[PDB]
Amino acid sequence: RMSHHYATIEVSQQLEQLLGDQLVILLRETPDGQALERSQNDFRRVLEQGRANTVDSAEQAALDGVRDAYLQLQAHTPALLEAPMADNDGFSEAFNGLRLRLQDLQQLALAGISEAETSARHRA
Incomplete structure (x- = not known):
């Protein structure tokens, strides 16, 4: 229900760090x-x-x-x-589109967590 969304948040954060490494190098x-x-x-x-x-x-x-x-x-x-x-x-433009997608991935994951939290409170 929820833990997999947290994993997605973590994937995005790691990608953002690695993207940053790439920019710094370039x-x-x-x-x-x-x-x-x-x-x-x-x-x-x-x-x-x-x-x-x-x-x-x-x-x-x-x-x-x-x-x-x-x-x-x-x-x-x-x-x-x-x-x-x-x-x-x-x-x-390519940089902008990628970073905005990584940010939205985290926002998407957060919304899934929020909806699972709500549903957990009404299952019992």
């Missing part, structure tokens, strides 16, 4: 390629294990959207990390 003058790849692979790991374990159907759909938004952001990673970002407006 913001440096000489970003480290191995660190960037590790952060991307870890974001993907957390997201995909999270999706595989998500029980709520609406949270599954939201995590699918997070995946698409993440791929959009990842697509902006320059082949050469010393190279300038090719599409700054696009990178900004």
Whole structure:
């Protein structure tokens, strides 16, 4: 009824931390390629294990959207990390869409918790 929503909140928080790591790396003058790849692979790991374990159907759909938004952001990673970002407006927009989705995932999870709390009080 409720514990799985808490797990979804945790997935989103971890993703947000890893996204932050990625931005911090990308913001440096000489970003480290191995660190960037590790952060991307870890974001993907957390997201995909999270999706595989998500029980709520609406949270599954939201995590699918997070995946698409993440791929959009990842697509902006320059082949050469010393190279300038090719599409700054696009990178900004992909970043914005992803962080807003991660925030809404948590809000969605919180709503499910709230509704389960209410239902628990009327089952007994």
